[PDB]
Design a protein around this ligand. Structure first.
Ligand SMILES: [Hg+2]
Length: 203
């Protein structure tokens, strides 16, 4: 068994540099949430989990500086969680084969009993997480027809063909989009205030 302090020690090991605190509170939450996930007995690694982690990281790290470190933090935190930094980016990028597919055909591939990978991962998720809802959000994003706009209307269509707790998927995605709105509002506040530090020190 491993400990939150041990997993944190692992991140503070490979990442000995400062953590650049605007997105810090999210990194700590992502560190502990993933730890509490994999240490659970029913957790199963899946490309749906991989898509959700990479989607949550890329969108929540909007404008991370310096840019060269955002991929190194991704590299260090993965092994810190005993994950694979390359296997996660491969699984997350593997969903691109569904770009432009209609939602009707996606439902057909699930209803046939033989869904292809990584779409097959919707059944073998294992222990549910908020990150699994984010992975579904990123998958439904790239589909054809702007299926994300009326998200609840889409999730109710998936409910009978998916084993996921749709009502918990609705909630965690609304919590996800509300949090993403706060960081971009804060990141835009940095751009509004970093010019006041750059255009007034040289004024
Ligand atoms: Hg990671």
């Amino acid at each position: 068994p491993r400990t939150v302090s041990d997993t944190k020690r692992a991140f503070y090991a490979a990442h000995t540099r400062p953590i650049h605190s605007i997105y810090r509170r999210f990194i700590e939450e992502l560190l502990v949430e993933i730890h509490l996930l994999r240490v659970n007995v029913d957790f199963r690694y899946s490309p749906l989990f991989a898509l959700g982690v990479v989607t949550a990281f890329d969108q929540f790290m909007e404008g991370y500086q310096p840019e060269g470190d955002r991929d190194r933090i991704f590299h260090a935190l993965c092994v810190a969680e005993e994950m694979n930094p390359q296997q996660l980016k491969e699984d997350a990028a593997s969903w691109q084969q569904y770009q432009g597919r209609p939602l009707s055909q996606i439902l057909d591939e699930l209803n046939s009993g033989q869904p292809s990978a990584p779409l097959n991962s919707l059944n073998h998720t294992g222990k549910y997480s908020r990150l699994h809802a984010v992975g579904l959000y990123a998958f439904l994003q790239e589909l054809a027809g702007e299926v994300t706009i009326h998200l609840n209307e889409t999730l109710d269509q998936l409910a009978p063909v998916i084993p996921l707790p749709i009502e918990k998927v609705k909630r965690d995605l609304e919590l996800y989009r509300s949090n993403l709105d706060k960081i971009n509002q804060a990141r835009s506040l940095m751009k509004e205030l970093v010019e006041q530090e750059r255009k007034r020190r040289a004024q």
